[PDB]
Amino acid sequence: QTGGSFFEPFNSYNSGTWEKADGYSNGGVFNCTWRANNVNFTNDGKLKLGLTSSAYNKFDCAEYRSTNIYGYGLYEVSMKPAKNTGIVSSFFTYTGPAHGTQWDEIDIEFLGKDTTKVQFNYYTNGVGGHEKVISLGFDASKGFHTYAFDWQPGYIKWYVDGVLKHTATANIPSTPGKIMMNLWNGTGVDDWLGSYNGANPLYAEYDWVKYTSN
Ligand code: NA
DSSP, X not given: OOOOOEEEOOSSOOTTTEEEOOSEEOOTTBOSEEOGGGEEXXXXXXXXXXXXXXXXXXXXXXXXXXXXXXXXXXXXXXEEOOOSTTEEEEEEEEEOGGGTXXXXXXXXXXXXXXXXXXXXXXXXXXXXXXXXXXXXXXXXTSSOEEEEEEEETTEEEEEETTEEEEEEOSSOOOSOBEEEEEEEEBSSOHHHHOOOOOOOOEEEEEEEEEEEEO
């Protein structure tokens, strides 16, 4: 039912293990439309997500996700988020209504307004409110760093370059979800993300993702 351990180096588009969001907007606070053309693979082997504009105040963003669902285990990413007011660069697990389940999600999010910090959160049956902002001690937009979360039945443990930065024990998610990565500009969450100034193009880079099942 759920996928097994894998290593993803982003050398090319593998249309059997991953897919590109295309032609729709998540709406709400998401003020951009997902475009497959904004999901690119560099020559030096990176997944590079772009936030673009081709029309007056009309933003094109990007998301990449697995075709498989995954359960408990260690999730690791090597990435460099975009730095700009009003955006988010992330790594997260997601399952929800549209997949015929409750909304269960675990996140690693970079608020563009300040890439010196990272935000950790999780949703269980759509109940969030577990935000934890960590000062990284470096500017994540400057180099690649390894971010990870160890998802187990009774806990969630988040790591930065192999160092434990946060542990959560309350109302932990349990529904297996897809692995996702995206870059987007917000609307009406100025408080949280800063307002978006329309700066384009903007890019988030990913060197690899690794999943280790129990
Ligand atoms: Na890579």
